[PDB]
Design a protein around this ligand. Structure first.
Ligand SMILES: CCCCC/C=C\C\C=C/C=C/C=C/[C@@H](SC[C@H](NC(=O)CC[C@H](N)C(=O)O)C(=O)NCC(=O)O)[C@@H](O)CCCC(=O)O
Length: 154
């Protein structure tokens, strides 16, 4: 697969310059806010390892993913994921803006039950108590993300 699924936003001109994968894909990231959310809200901790591997506590069971760059879409990654209930899926993401040490705003998109992909904007924080950073104010305005939903971390 050489480009993100049709229907997913490639965010051309909207992704940060100079993304440093080595500084992003290290340590833990808590998913604290998102544009769209479900109930009940939860606190997903994304654990990263070498070679774009990650683990997180998903809605029904732990999830393990293996990432790779998407050849045709700068900044995008494809993650092949499996869940402890026996599920498997492919999810795409790009880091829109991050300071690596505190926050990261991501775009995520993938097929999840239909030909029409579902997408979202996600705010990750290094601390479970993290909220909306001042540094993202202008970017959130530009993307019309002025009321992110708080999830289940504190
Ligand atoms: C450090 C940050 C790294 C970021 C890495 C980026 C992407 C890879 C990681 C996670 C991806 C999660 C995707 C979840 C799918 S849902 C994806 C999938 N579901 C299906 O594919 C179901 C298919 C069909 N609906 C069915 O019922 O069979 C599934 O089983 N998910 C389990 C679960 O969510 O716990 C939806 O809940 C997403 C909804 C919109 C969104 O928030 O993106």
């Amino acid at each position: 697969v050489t480009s993100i699924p049709t229907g997913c936003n490639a965010l051309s001109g909207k992704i940060m310059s100079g993304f440093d994968a080595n500084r992003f894909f290290t340590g833990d990231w808590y998913l604290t806010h998102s544009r769209d959310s479900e109930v009940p809200v939860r606190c997903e901790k994304y654990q990263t390892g070498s070679n774009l591997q990650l683990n997180f506590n998903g809605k029904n069971g732990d999830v393990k993913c293996s990432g790779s760059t998407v050849s045709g879409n700068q900044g995008f990654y494809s993650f092949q994921c499996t869940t402890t209930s026996g599920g498997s899926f492919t999810s795409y993401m790009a880091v829109v803006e991050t300071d690596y040490a505190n926050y990261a705003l991501l775009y995520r998109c993938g097929l999840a039950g239909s030909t029409t992909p579902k997408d979202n904007f996600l705010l990750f924080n290094r601390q479970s108590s993290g909220e909306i950073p001042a540094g993202l104010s202008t970017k959130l305005n530009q993307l019309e993300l002025t009321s992110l939903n708080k999830l289940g971390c504190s």
